[PDB]
Structure formats: structure tokens, C-alpha cells
Design a protein around this nucleic acid. Sequence first.
RNA 1: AGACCAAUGCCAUGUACGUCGCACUCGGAAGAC
Lengths: 114, 86
Amino acid sequence: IESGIAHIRSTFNNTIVTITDTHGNAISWSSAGALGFRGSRKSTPFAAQMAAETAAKGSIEHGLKTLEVTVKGPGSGREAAIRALQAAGLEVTAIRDVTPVPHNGCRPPKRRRV
Amino acid sequence: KGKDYHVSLELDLRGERYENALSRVEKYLDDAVLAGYPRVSIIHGKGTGALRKGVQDLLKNHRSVKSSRFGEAGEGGSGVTVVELK
RNA sequence: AGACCAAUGCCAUGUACGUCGCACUCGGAAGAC
């Protein structure tokens, strides 16, 4: 269990962190709610940053060194967690900006001010 | 008595090179030897590489610095290098 | 311009090259004269 992939969702309300194997097999995950943020505080970059090192701590004891990260959705947690990973001593080899961008997809929900 | 020279608490080295940054950083860190203070923060903006590694290594090897750590919410995240003085 | 010029114990003599880069986020309620 030497290499893995860390996936993080960067939403406007939360930031999930999950790690997996090249075979797409999960090991551990964390979140702002997992740590104890309940309100809008989950959206803060700090919550995602905390999420990063708890994920790293859940990762090391199974012995994985090299990572490369996929980021989903736009949010404040884009920059925090990715450098929190290398702050936690790990080594992330690539940054992938994979988000679902449908060509037309489905008609989005209604507006927020009607 | 150390009274004839003054010390500050913040470093500004916008766009400086490796060796010039070394020359200014060593002076900045050694200034507070006679007038110690809690810590300092470093900001540049952005640059063309990753000399943060060398700067952090020098700071961790610095004699008069107890340790170096990173920034909280009010310090541009944990990416900002913070030099914890004695 | 035009006199005289016979000779220099042994070794090894170097050093010498393959150069560049620092870091900040989007927003409650409020009636009437």
C-alpha cells in the first residue's frame, strides 16, 4: 500500500477528503463534519485543511507515501488542503482539476431569488 | 545595553534572488538577537520557483530560532512560513 | 657595409572544473403615518 490517490470535493458548504488505491480501492476518509464542524464553518478553508492532515494520519499507518490529488467542484478548500497534504509530510505528484462539466447535461435548478 | 539599533517584526523581500534573499534574511533573523520578539511572517506575492524549501531549511538550522512553524487563518493559511523565536 | 663567438651532468616540471530556483475567502429581518 505504497501509492494512492487522494480525492477532495471543494463545495461551497463542505470539503470531503478520501484516499484510494490505483485500483480505485478506498482506505480512509475525513471531513469537516467528521472532525466536528457543523455549521457554515465546514466551508472555511481551515476545516478542509484540518481534514487534510487527519486523512494523512489515517494514511501513513497503512504505509502509503506517494499521492496525486483530484479536486472536484469550486470552493475555498481548493488551495488549503492540497498544500496541507505536503505540510503533513506526504508527497503529492500531480494535481487534477477533474470536475463534471456536462456539455449540456440536465437543466439546472431554478434561480435563488424568485 | 542594546539601545542604539532598532528591530522590526516583519520581512519583505519581493522578487529577490536566492543569495540576496539569504543575505537579507540572515540579517533580519539576527537583528532580534539583542531584542527578541515572538515570531515573524514572510510574504512575497508570487515567484518563479520554490525557494521556500531552502528558506525553511535555513530557518530550521538557524541558531537563535527555537523553531519555525506555519500560519493560522489570519496568516494566509498554513502555507506562510512562521519563524518561532525563543 | 667587412678583428674575434670553442662548451653548458642526472630527472620531472604541473594546475585546469562538470554552475541555479521563494507563498491569501462572498453578504439575516425591517409593517404603517
